[PDB]
Scaffold this active site. Structure first.
Site, short mmCIF file in Angstrom:
data_model
loop_
_atom_site.label_atom_id
_atom_site.label_comp_id
_atom_site.label_asym_id
_atom_site.label_seq_id
_atom_site.Cartn_x
_atom_site.Cartn_y
_atom_site.Cartn_z
N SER A 186 0.79 -1.22 0.00
CA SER A 186 0.00 0.00 0.00
C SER A 186 0.82 1.27 0.00
O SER A 186 1.69 1.45 0.85
CB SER A 186 -0.93 0.04 1.19
OG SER A 186 -1.51 1.33 1.25
N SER B 39 -5.66 7.67 -0.90
CA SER B 39 -5.66 6.23 -1.11
C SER B 39 -6.84 5.74 -1.89
O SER B 39 -7.95 6.25 -1.73
CB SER B 39 -5.62 5.49 0.22
OG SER B 39 -5.29 4.13 -0.01
N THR C 200 -1.43 3.06 -8.18
CA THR C 200 -2.33 3.91 -8.94
C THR C 200 -1.67 4.78 -10.00
O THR C 200 -1.87 4.59 -11.20
CB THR C 200 -3.15 4.86 -8.03
OG1 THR C 200 -3.90 4.09 -7.08
CG2 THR C 200 -4.13 5.69 -8.87
N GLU D 165 -2.50 -3.50 3.23
CA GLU D 165 -2.64 -2.45 4.22
C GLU D 165 -2.94 -3.09 5.54
O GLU D 165 -3.72 -4.05 5.62
CB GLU D 165 -3.76 -1.51 3.82
CG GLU D 165 -5.15 -2.11 4.01
CD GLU D 165 -6.26 -1.13 3.65
OE1 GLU D 165 -6.06 -0.25 2.72
OE2 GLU D 165 -7.38 -1.17 4.27
N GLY E 107 -3.55 -2.03 -2.15
CA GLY E 107 -2.30 -2.61 -1.63
C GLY E 107 -2.40 -3.06 -0.17
O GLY E 107 -3.12 -2.45 0.64
#
Ligand SMILES: Nc1ncnc2c1ncn2[C@@H]1O[C@H](COP(=O)(O)OP(=O)(O)O)[C@@H](O)[C@H]1O
Ligand code: ALF
Ligand SMILES: [Mg+2]
Lengths: 148, 787
Positions: B178, B238, B183, B457, B455
């Site tokens: 994460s 996020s 992205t 996390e 991701g």
């Protein structure tokens, strides 16, 4: 060049000035030679232009009398392509002896090797020779640009 | 002896124009130079002083210090000729040390993208490097793998062509923990393909007029980013839901369509956000970007006037929500949402917030908390196009109908909220899924797949969400392991080439069964599914049973004697995690007051009408969340296995969200749990390139015109001739049954040559084309003249 044609050459040269001084920018030389049925490579044109530079290639001008001497110099050359070999080269991109190449692979090569063309240039060329599967038959495309 | 590099190019290009200093070329004598432990550098330079059996004495070529370590804690150093390499698969020494080193250098030099055999690493910069621009786009356009330096725009073009070459769909899968940038790197891939493959209406950084659809394809992601992304202790913006974008190309190679498969939208947080976290951007955007007029129009009181916003109004660094609004507002329009078609999507937001003010104070008389205040729901019911009184009753006294009975009953203060809560909370999701199909309504033989999953996390409260999330992450990784070591070696067997297996020891199947598998040894998801359908069962009850089944699972572990909270642990690939099974059965069931449900189902407000128009699955007494998901996630895992994967392993540099800061070990582990090294061994060890006997004697015959006789001949043998004709070294290739297996680069060079063998001709032909293409378009301007 018989005056008969030389007389007409002028008609073509003249038929090439947006404004009017009667001058063909060092750039246009190429197309004007082509329009007169000439296929000078990109080098064969610069060689008889004193190898100028982009900038000055859009400033410098030409007058028929100084242009004509070049039209011929080119006109008389050592070689030329031909189906025989021309296609022999494209047939190397024929994925599987089908006799046709993908209008995308042809579109590539033409714009990534030698006298690199432009995305639009190739578009305008092959455009309309790709089939349902976007497949072009070189043998023909060859003749097209040629006999055309 | 090369060209000079602009200060910028120095960010994607290596500075090599220097003097051939023999300082390093002389220091080499200290051959005893090796790599060794470092509680602060992961590894560090030093030189052998004395080899003493299982141990060896060495002095740090750094601190001048002299320490002796085991003759197995030292690692070979790579020559100075390898500094800041482009493809790790090149350095003559593969090490957790060198591989690290290289990455460290290039990183500090300003380059983040690096190749590692087939896949490529990409350490987050955290800084605004300047290596994305129309300028740079055209630089890479068409440019081969080596004709340029590692960059994302490169992976994109490498795939986008590969597709049009061997006609076989592809995928670009961004891994990484994460925050590591999964992205961004996706937004680029689209960014590039949006210009490099689009069709033009004829015709500096972002300066460029794109097609009509590519216009939208571009403005989509900035929308889902609104209702879908939110600030967390790991990332100010996020991605709160996995996403798999699909781009569609015609035969000519042009973009024509685009789909978007959204996944696990953690809409939980829409009601309560953790410490130092925020809700879905759009919320704040609205509470602020709201126009004075429309301000009241949706009853948008200021910040901290709403209870769904924990930590009141928290700000986001470098980002201004104020403008953020317009940006997305602007986007929505670009996309297609009708002028009003938006105003609506906004009220429905305020609504999802007001519904939070609604109160229910206990009643020690009857013990069924009430609606001591109208204003709250008073407003809310207005935005819903529904009615108060009705809503109220339904919300307080469920005029339900269990089984063969119209069991009319009244809930308790709590229940009174668990509903009004899990109502808005789901009213939200009803929005996302809606927009997504509005977006997907415009964006819509070949397809390119870009996967942006959420991701790994792992915060404080490791809820259910975090479980499926870190599940997928474990899932995906294993994919890379399969396709990278497992699969590759099978085909070596199949074709029957001279090859022996190699166990890279990289499998997580186990940790998946512990949570995936159903019947037979049940999975974490399994239990929580059925145990979710039995009265005398509680999250606790669950966990206890959980210990029952798994219990001694090599990948399971019990909490810190806090079954009070009742938590469990599981050994993921990215590490251990203590999940809090609490409230899992509820979420896993997703229940809610159908009374108010249907109440809306026919509300006056059409938008809310169509939004809810499908309420047939509501619960008032079918399929489980965990399997609803786990079912579609097998759909995805299915197409991926049917496409060609292109891995872009993102890597987080530090958790301090610091730029220029790079934690050695944190980055050392990532390269460990991700399988980088191994991922490179096979690229060097095996033969990652293969080509069938026909296409080979086809493409490169021009190289050996006289190797194959005039007569026919067996594809194999007939092409083995021309291999002798190139006197190819018997270690570069590997002849198989139907195809030949080559070594890295061996085919590239073969291609180069052929492209040379035909350049002139191309040059020749190209000419006649400019000729033809010319005489004609000139003799055209002649018609408009003769017109
Ligand atoms: N190449 C990059 N250029 C600029 N910023 C980037 C880059 N890679 C990542 N970031 C930074 O890192 C942050 C988060 O990365 P992100 O793509 O959101 O990760 P993930 O999808 O894995 O959660 C961004 O908010 C941004 O500041
Ligand atoms: F937003 Al992420 F992994 F993509 F935390
Ligand atoms: Mg993300």
């Amino acid at each position: 060049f018989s005056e008969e044609q030389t007389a007409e050459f002028k008609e073509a040269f003249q038929l090439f000035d947006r404004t009017g001084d009667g001058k063909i920018l060092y750039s246009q030389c190429g197309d004007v030679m082509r329009a007169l049925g000439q296929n000078p490579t990109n080098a064969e044109v610069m060689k008889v232009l004193g190898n100028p530079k982009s900038d000055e290639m859009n400033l410098k001008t030409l007058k028929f009398e100084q242009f004509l001497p070049m039209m011929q110099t080119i006109a008389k050359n050592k070689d030329q392509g031909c189906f025989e070999d021309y296609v022999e080269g494209l047939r190397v991109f024929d994925k599987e002896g089908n006799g046709t190449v993908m209008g995308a692979e042809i579109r590539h090569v033409l714009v990534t090797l030698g006298e690199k063309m432009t995305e639009e240039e190739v578009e305008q060329l092959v455009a309309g020779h790709e089939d349902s599967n976007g497949c072009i038959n070189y043998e023909e495309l060859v003749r097209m640009v040629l006999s055309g | 002896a090369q060209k000079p590099l602009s200060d910028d190019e120095k960010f994607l290009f290596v500075d090599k124009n220097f003097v051939n200093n023999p300082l390093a070329q002389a220091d080499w004598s200290a051959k005893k130079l090796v790599w060794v432990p470092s509680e602060k550098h992961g590894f560090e330079a030093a030189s052998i002083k004395e080899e003493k059996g299982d141990e060896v004495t060495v002095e740090l070529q750094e601190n001048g210090k002299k320490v002796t370590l085991s003759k197995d804690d030292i690692q070979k150093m790579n020559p100075p000729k390898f500094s800041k390499v482009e493809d790790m698969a090149e350095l003559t020494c593969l090490n957790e040390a060198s591989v690290l080193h290289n990455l460290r250098e290039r990183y500090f030099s300003g380059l983040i993208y690096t190749y590692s055999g087939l896949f490529c690493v990409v350490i987050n910069p955290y800084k605004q490097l300047p290596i994305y621009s129309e300028k740079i786009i055209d630089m890479y356009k068409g440019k081969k793998r080596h004709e340029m330096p590692p960059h994302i725009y490169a992976i994109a073009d490498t795939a986008y062509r590969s597709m049009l070459q061997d006609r076989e769909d592809q995928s670009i899968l961004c891994t990484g923990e994460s925050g590591a940038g999964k992205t961004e790197n996706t937004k680029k891939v689209i960014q590039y393909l949006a210009v490099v493959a689009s069709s033009h209406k004829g015709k500096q950084g972002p300066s460029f007029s794109y097609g009509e659809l590519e216009k939208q394809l571009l403005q989509a992601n900035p929308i889902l980013e609104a209702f879908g992304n939110a600030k967390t202790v790991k990332n100010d913006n996020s991605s709160r839901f996995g996403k798999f974008i699909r781009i569609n190309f015609d035969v000519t190679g042009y973009i024509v369509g685009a789909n978007i498969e959204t996944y696990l939208l953690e809409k939980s947080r829409a009601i309560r956000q953790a410490k130092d976290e925020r809700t879905f951007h759009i919320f704040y955007y609205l509470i602020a970007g709201a126009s004075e007029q429309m301000r009241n129009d949706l009853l948008l009181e200021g910040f901290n006037n709403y209870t769904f916003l924990s930590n009141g109004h928290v700000p986001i660094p470098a980002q201004q929500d104020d403008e953020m609004f317009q940006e997305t507002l602007e986007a929505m329009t670009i996309m297609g949402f009708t002028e009003e078609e938006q105003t609506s999507i906004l009220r429905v937001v305020s609504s999802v917030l007001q519904l939070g003010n609604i109160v229910f104070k206990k009643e020690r008389n009857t013990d069924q908390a009430s609606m001591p205040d109208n204003t709250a729901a008073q407003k809310v019911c207005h935005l819903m196009g529904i009615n108060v009184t009705d809503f109220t009753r339904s919300i307080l006294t469920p005029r339900i109908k269990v089984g063969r009975d119209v069991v009319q009953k009244a809930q308790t203060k709590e229940q009174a909220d668990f509903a009004i809560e899990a109502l808005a909370k789901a009213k939200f999701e009803r929005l996302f899924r809606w927009i997504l199909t509005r977006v997907n309504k415009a964006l819509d033989a070949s397809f390119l797949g870009i996967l942006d999953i959420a991701g790994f996390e792992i915060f404080e409260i490791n809820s259910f969400e975090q479980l499926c999330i870190n599940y997928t992450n474990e899932k995906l990784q294993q994919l890379f392991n399969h396709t990278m070591f497992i699969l590759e070696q099978e085909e070596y067997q199949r074709e029957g080439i001279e090859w022996n297996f190699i166990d890279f020891g990289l499998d997580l199947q186990p940790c998946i069964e512990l949570i995936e598998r159903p019947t037979n040894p049940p999975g974490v998801l399994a239990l929580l599914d059925e145990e979710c359908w039995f009265p005398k069962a509680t999250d606790t009850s669950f966990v206890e049973k959980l210990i029952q089944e798994q219990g001694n699972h090599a990948k399971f572990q019990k909490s810190k004697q806090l079954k009070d909270k009742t938590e469990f642990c599981i050994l993921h690939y990215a590490g251990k995690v203590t999940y809090n099974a609490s409230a899992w059965l509820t979420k896993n069931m997703d229940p809610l007051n159908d009374n108010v449900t249907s109440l809306l189902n026919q509300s006056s407000d059409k938008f809310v009408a169509d939004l809810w128009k499908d309420v047939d699955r509501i619960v008032g007494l079918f399929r489980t969340v965990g399997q609803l998901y786990k079912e579609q996630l097998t759909k995805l895992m299915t197409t991926l296995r049917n496409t060609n994967p292109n891995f872009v392993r993102c890597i987080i540099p530090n958790h301090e969200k610091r730029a220029g800061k790079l934690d050695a070990h944190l980055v050392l582990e990532q390269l460990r749990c991700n399988g980088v090294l191994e991922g490179i061994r096979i690229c060097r060890q095996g033969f990652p390139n293969r080509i069938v006997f026909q296409e080979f004697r086809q493409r490169y015959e021009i190289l050996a015109a006289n190797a194959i006789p005039k007569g026919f001949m067996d594809g194999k043998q007939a092409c083995i001739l021309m291999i002798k004709a190139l006197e190819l070294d018997p270690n570069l290739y590997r002849i198989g049954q139907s195809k030949i297996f080559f070594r890295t680069g061996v085919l590239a060079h073969l291609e180069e040559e052929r492209d040379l063998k035909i350049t002139d001709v191309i040059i020749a032909f190209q000419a006649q084309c400019r000729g033809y293409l010319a005489r004609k378009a000139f003799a055209k301007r002649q018609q408009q003249l003769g017109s």
